[PDB]
Design a protein around this nucleic acid. Structure first.
Ligand SMILES: [K+]
Ligand SMILES: [K+]
Ligand SMILES: [K+]
Ligand SMILES: [K+]
Ligand SMILES: [K+]
Ligand SMILES: [K+]
Ligand SMILES: [K+]
Ligand SMILES: [K+]
Ligand SMILES: [K+]
Ligand SMILES: [K+]
Ligand SMILES: [K+]
Ligand SMILES: [K+]
Ligand SMILES: [K+]
Ligand SMILES: [K+]
Ligand SMILES: [K+]
Ligand SMILES: [K+]
Ligand SMILES: [K+]
Ligand SMILES: [K+]
Ligand SMILES: [K+]
Ligand SMILES: [K+]
Ligand SMILES: [K+]
Ligand SMILES: [K+]
Ligand SMILES: [K+]
Ligand SMILES: [K+]
Ligand SMILES: [K+]
Ligand SMILES: [K+]
Ligand SMILES: [K+]
Ligand SMILES: [K+]
Ligand SMILES: [K+]
Ligand SMILES: [K+]
Ligand SMILES: [K+]
Ligand SMILES: [K+]
Ligand SMILES: [K+]
Ligand SMILES: [K+]
Ligand SMILES: [Mg+2]
Ligand SMILES: [Mg+2]
Ligand SMILES: [Mg+2]
Ligand SMILES: [Mg+2]
Ligand SMILES: [Mg+2]
Ligand SMILES: [Mg+2]
Ligand SMILES: [Mg+2]
Ligand SMILES: [Mg+2]
Ligand SMILES: [Mg+2]
Ligand SMILES: [Mg+2]
Ligand SMILES: [Mg+2]
Ligand SMILES: [Mg+2]
Ligand SMILES: [Mg+2]
Ligand SMILES: [Mg+2]
Ligand SMILES: [Mg+2]
Ligand SMILES: [Mg+2]
Ligand SMILES: [Mg+2]
Ligand SMILES: [Mg+2]
Ligand SMILES: [Mg+2]
Ligand SMILES: [Mg+2]
Ligand SMILES: [Mg+2]
Ligand SMILES: [Mg+2]
Ligand SMILES: [Mg+2]
Ligand SMILES: [Mg+2]
Ligand SMILES: [Mg+2]
Ligand SMILES: [Mg+2]
Ligand SMILES: [Zn+2]
Lengths: 97, 131, 110, 89, 219
RNA sequence: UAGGGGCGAAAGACCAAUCGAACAGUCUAGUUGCUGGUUCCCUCCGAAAUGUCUAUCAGGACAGCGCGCACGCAGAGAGAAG
RNA sequence: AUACCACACACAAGGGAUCGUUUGGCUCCUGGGACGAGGAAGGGCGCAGCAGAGAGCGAUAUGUGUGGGAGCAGCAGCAAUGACCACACGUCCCCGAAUACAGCAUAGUGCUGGAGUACUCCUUGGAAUUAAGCAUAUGAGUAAAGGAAGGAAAAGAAACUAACGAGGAUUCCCGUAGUAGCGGCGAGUGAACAGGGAACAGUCCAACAGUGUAAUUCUCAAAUGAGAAGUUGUCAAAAGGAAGAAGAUGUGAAUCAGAAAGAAAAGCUGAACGAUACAGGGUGAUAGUCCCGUAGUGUCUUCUUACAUACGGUGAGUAGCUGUGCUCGGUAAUGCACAGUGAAGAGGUGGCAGUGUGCAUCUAAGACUAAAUACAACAGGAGACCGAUAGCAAAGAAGUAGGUUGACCGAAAACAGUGAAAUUGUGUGUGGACCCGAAUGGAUCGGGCCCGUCUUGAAACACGGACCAAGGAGUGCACAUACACUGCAAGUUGAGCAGAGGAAGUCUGUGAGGCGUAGUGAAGACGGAAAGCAGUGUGAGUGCGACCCGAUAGACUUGUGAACUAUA
């Protein structure tokens, strides 16, 4: 059997290359900026025209009573992900302020 | 040796091709050699035997005989020659058929289209001979 | 079952199993030869095959061996003073998915 | 009794000649053919491979299909009086 | 295995073989599927999955061809196969280049001058129809083996000699054991071309050395 | 009115000489620790019907007794004398 | 034993074995993959000078045109004013999707329906069987039943692998591998990346179209007008070519004679001649030169294929979550669904559940794509295949004669050859069931129960066997194994695939992988004996029909039946 002869320490070694730095892409052109602005704008109009959904109302009500941990549990069960819940709570909080 | 792979060398296939032949391919089966003189009178080396032509029998019972072709049986490949016959118990006489290749032509029957048939073959040769 | 053997394990239970024979092997070889030949006439002066880069093999087991890859990167082509449309016209293969991460690998392909 | 004497009463006839398939299997009361399912639009499911090959394409004359193959070989030439219509099209 | 068949079982004073289901024909009640039945299925039907070819080591193939070539220059072996060589001056024969022959007419005159007349005649007189069913399956005529001609460089002589019965031709670089030892007995008579004879030194090398043309092989 | 369905003044009766679950065809060459059969000559060697475990008792496997190839070699299915 | 019964031999009967033969079958390879409302596939009925079946053809039931050219098989008649054949066209009765119909689109014309389905895609979904019982599991996502398309079909340009010093669409071959794992952890099941090759190709829509004028598509007119679609958004450019391949068809060398003998010479004997042609077939026995071809050479006809504009980073009842059912090697969820619930613009993944945080790699919920790969009908070429109880069921008018109420079921028969055995008559001989040993001029003497088979034990009142011929049962593949034989040896090897070559053979490269070169532990970790690899075969184990024949049964169908009998 030609397997499992080296230790983990010696398997971790590596050859000394010379690396190339990554080309950063930070510049964003004028036309790309206007494009992003118009999309964010459109998102405002929808919220203005049609308002909040039932679970969003129930959530925001709990935030007024400082029921932070109840709101957390509630949102987790509605959206599934604990990450989506943490994000949606932060967006709702900012809307109320 | 044969180097063309589209042509068959099977015994079973060659035999079926022979016996089931029709049309012009059937006519090719009735060819006979010409005598030495006629091969100077005309370009051709061999022709299909027809009634009225004159033939020497060169193999079999009736060897050395000469006579006029009476009939040509295409289905059972045989030729009937004047004066080649057998006598029954009754005294009645029946012409016995000879296979084309056992004959040789001595004089050609030139009735009907024969002169045009010969011309057509001579031209077909020269067309490629002279090139 | 009797005596001493390595315990059987032969997988022939399934009645729907297909068999593949290879009686066609010499003939299919001859067809591939004849297709290459005729393809070679259609583009007579030009080679039938394109030029390909040299890359390094994958695991710890093959690190020390070099091999042909799929295509040159836009950076390799540009560094040698060519443009992508020209490279294609001259029979160089191109692969825009590949990335360059070493100095050595770049220098060799140039 | 159920043998010879009961055979005497067997003088009625439930099947007649089918107009689609010929096979003397049209049940008059049911209004259906037991060989080919007439009057349904599709032909019946045949019981096995042996029995269905007995009624496939090529078991009869194939009149139209044979002519089509010969015309395709020739390059679909059409009636020679009307060549100009063909050539324009 | 085509028919509809079933066993009648015991109690009918008959053997319990499967039988054909039918009526109106003499075929009713006959014995169907088994190997001991007329029109039934054979025992262990022959099948395409059988192993048709056979392997032999490359090192043995190389060695066998080398010692087959050797045997073509021992008179005892050549005579033993049945080639007749009473009139031939010396073995081996090596024809020159600068043979400018193009016609079979002049080609035979050359072979006669090397003493091969009796050998060639022995082949022509041999033709006979095979005994047995092989004469129906495209194997009708049998002939005796004669000289093999071996060339290496393309020349007109090849197509001048080939219509002569029993003459056979191969290139030195792809010389086969079926041609060198027919029927598995060694010592076939060979006409060498001058180029081909010199090439044997590149192909098999020298004793206790390695051939350059056959990698990994030594004599 | 049609097959795990019908129909029955009820006998498990009858449903194309078939009914305590029809016919046709296929899966399918279903399975069998059980019964029957198993095709040329001469030469040399030659058994067992016992032990352990088994949903085991008409079957298996392991060991014991045959044969073939045999590295090698002072032993023995008998007595004496302590 | 005059005449009965038995045996031997000769002749005549009776049957069709054996040997000789074959315009048929089977297998592998290559091409092809061509149907229908312009009425198909399949069924029926008519048509000849004498004509039943089969073949061919439609009331034009042997018509027209082109290329050829000699007879029409029997009898009577026809034929250079064209017998007969080959290529195309014209004509083409009734039933059948069967339609004067149904559904559906356009400004309008229209399109679909039925047939076929070996191979490919989408659904639905068993049981026999194995586990020595059987219920999870297996057989198997197989059989069966439905829908759909093409000469191939499907797939296809990363919400991809990997942790290397990394690679880079899909499909196919060698391989990782009978491994990691799944499993009454039983029986059994079971993938992926790498490394070596064949073939190679990338692009479109939405997001996002000239506003100093819809610049766009269609119809009729006209030589410049009317009208329809469309602002719920139309419109984003090139001709062009010689190559490549497959068929059809023309031509095409060279011999005569003889004794004996035979029905007949091509045999045998002597003398010649051709060969870039001695592949094969036919001729009254075995032919290079008698006939058709073959090697070599000409012509012609079809088919295939090729240059232009404008752009990016947000595609929702979706991804995901909870419950549930099926599925996969996928294991605290591999994929697919249904109901509740339901995002963010930034999200998805890194083979073990959760929370946090850097790092690497990608961009789902819209579309198209060649080549390399698979396999019926029909056509062509080959074979260590079968040779009339064989080979396809079918070497002749075979899916026929004939049969089922029905679904469905289904034979025999070669040559006017040879002419075995069982069995029969006549003649001549020898015996009274016959075999073994030994003999006479002649009476006979001695020994022997009926074979095969299970069985402690068969001549058995155990079973199978009236007689003869022909057929009739340890085989093939995969995986480990011990032995015999062969080459090389710390190494070894015909992987696939490329190069050469009138070629399914052979020769030569490139080049993986596997096993071996030393073991110990679950592992972290450590390290210190023992010739192998690949073949050719034999004995033997396991899985597949598995030495040959044989159940009662179980399941599945868009298959059939109330002519007998039950009841309304
Ligand atoms: K090759
Ligand atoms: K019927
Ligand atoms: K159908
Ligand atoms: K069957
Ligand atoms: K009653
Ligand atoms: K009863
Ligand atoms: K039932
Ligand atoms: K038992
Ligand atoms: K003994
Ligand atoms: K016991
Ligand atoms: K044992
Ligand atoms: K359809
Ligand atoms: K079982
Ligand atoms: K069992
Ligand atoms: K199945
Ligand atoms: K496609
Ligand atoms: K697609
Ligand atoms: K991939
Ligand atoms: K590759
Ligand atoms: K000739
Ligand atoms: K003669
Ligand atoms: K002749
Ligand atoms: K997208
Ligand atoms: K959904
Ligand atoms: K895509
Ligand atoms: K038969
Ligand atoms: K019939
Ligand atoms: K006979
Ligand atoms: K006879
Ligand atoms: K017995
Ligand atoms: K007794
Ligand atoms: K018994
Ligand atoms: K076995
Ligand atoms: K059975
Ligand atoms: Mg480790
Ligand atoms: Mg590293
Ligand atoms: Mg009645
Ligand atoms: Mg009724
Ligand atoms: Mg058979
Ligand atoms: Mg024989
Ligand atoms: Mg006992
Ligand atoms: Mg017993
Ligand atoms: Mg059971
Ligand atoms: Mg299962
Ligand atoms: Mg499975
Ligand atoms: Mg199916
Ligand atoms: Mg766009
Ligand atoms: Mg003959
Ligand atoms: Mg499962
Ligand atoms: Mg997982
Ligand atoms: Mg025979
Ligand atoms: Mg037969
Ligand atoms: Mg009847
Ligand atoms: Mg007893
Ligand atoms: Mg008996
Ligand atoms: Mg026999
Ligand atoms: Mg292995
Ligand atoms: Mg060691
Ligand atoms: Mg069996
Ligand atoms: Mg059951
Ligand atoms: Zn019908």
């Amino acid at each position: 059997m030609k397997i499992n002869k080296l230790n983990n320490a010696s398997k971790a070694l590596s050859y000394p290359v010379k690396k190339l730095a990554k080309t950063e892409k930070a510049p964003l052109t004028e036309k790309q900026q206007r494009s992003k602005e118009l999309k964010k704008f459109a998102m405002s109009i929808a919220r203005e025209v049609g308002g909040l959904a039932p679970y969003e109302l129930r959530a925001t009500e709990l935030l007024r009573r400082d029921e932070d941990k109840r709101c957390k549990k509630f949102m987790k069960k509605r959206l599934g992900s604990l990450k989506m819940a943490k994000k949606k709570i932060e967006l709702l909080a900012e809307e109320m302020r | 040796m044969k180097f063309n792979k589209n042509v068959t060398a099977s015994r079973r296939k060659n035999r079926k091709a022979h016996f089931t032949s029709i049309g012009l391919e059937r006519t090719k089966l009735m060819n006979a050699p010409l005598s030495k003189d006629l091969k100077e009178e005309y370009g051709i080396k061999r022709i299909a035997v027809r009634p009225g032509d004159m033939v020497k029998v060169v193999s079999g019972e009736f060897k050395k005989k000469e006579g006029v072709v009476m009939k040509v049986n295409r289905h059972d490949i045989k030729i009937e020659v004047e004066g080649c016959f057998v006598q029954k118990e009754d005294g009645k006489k029946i012409n016995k058929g000879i296979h084309p290749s056992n004959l040789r032509i001595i004089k050609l029957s030139m009735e009907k289209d024969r002169a045009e048939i010969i011309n057509k073959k001579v031209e077909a040769m020269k067309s490629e001979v002279k090139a | 079952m009797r005596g001493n053997q390595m315990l059987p394990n032969n997988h022939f239970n399934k009645g729907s199993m297909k068999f593949k024979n290879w009686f066609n092997q010499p003939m299919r070889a001859l067809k591939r030869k004849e297709v290459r030949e005729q393809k070679s006439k259609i583009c007579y002066p030009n080679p039938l095959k394109k030029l390909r880069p040299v890359v390094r093999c994958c695991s710890m087991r093959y690190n020390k061996k070099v091999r042909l890859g799929r295509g040159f990167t836009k950076m390799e082509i540009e560094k040698a003073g060519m443009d992508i449309k020209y490279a294609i016209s001259v029979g160089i293969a191109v692969d825009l998915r590949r990335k360059n991460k070493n100095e050595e690998g770049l220098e060799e392909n140039v | 009794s159920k043998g010879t004497p009961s055979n005497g009463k067997k003088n009625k006839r439930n099947h007649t000649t089918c107009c689609r398939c010929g096979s003397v299997s049209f049940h008059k009361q049911k209004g259906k053919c037991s060989s080919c399912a007439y009057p349904e639009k599709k032909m019946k499911k045949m019981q096995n491979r042996k029995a269905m090959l007995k009624k496939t394409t090529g078991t009869g004359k194939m009149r139209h299909m044979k002519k089509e193959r010969i015309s395709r070989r020739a390059g679909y030439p059409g009636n020679p009086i009307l060549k100009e219509i063909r050539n324009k099209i | 295995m085509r028919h509809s068949a079933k066993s009648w079982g015991t109690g009918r004073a008959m053997a319990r073989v499967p039988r054909v289901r039918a009526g109106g024909t003499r075929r009713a009640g006959q014995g169907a599927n088994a190997n001991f039945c007329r029109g039934g299925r054979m025992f262990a039907p022959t099948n395409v999955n059988r192993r048709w070819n056979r392997k032999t080591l490359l090192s043995i193939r190389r060695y066998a061809s080398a010692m087959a070539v050797a045997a073509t220059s021992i008179p005892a072996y050549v005579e033993g196969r049945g080639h007749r060589i009473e009139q031939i001056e010396n073995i081996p024969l090596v024809l020159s280049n600068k043979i400018d022959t193009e016609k079979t007419k002049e080609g035979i005159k050359i072979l006669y001058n090397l003493g091969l007349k009796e050998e060639l005649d022995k082949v022509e007189e041999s033709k006979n129809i095979r005994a047995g069913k092989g004469k129906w399956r495209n194997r009708r005529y049998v002939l005796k083996k004669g000289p093999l001609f071996v060339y290496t460089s393309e020349t007109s002589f090849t197509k001048a000699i080939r219509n002569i019965p029993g003459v056979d031709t191969e290139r030195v670089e792809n010389l086969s054991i079926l041609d060198l030892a027919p029927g598995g007995q060694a010592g076939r008579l060979i006409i060498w071309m001058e180029d081909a004879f010199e090439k044997l030194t590149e192909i098999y090398g020298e004793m206790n050395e390695e051939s350059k043309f056959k990698k990994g092989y030594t004599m």
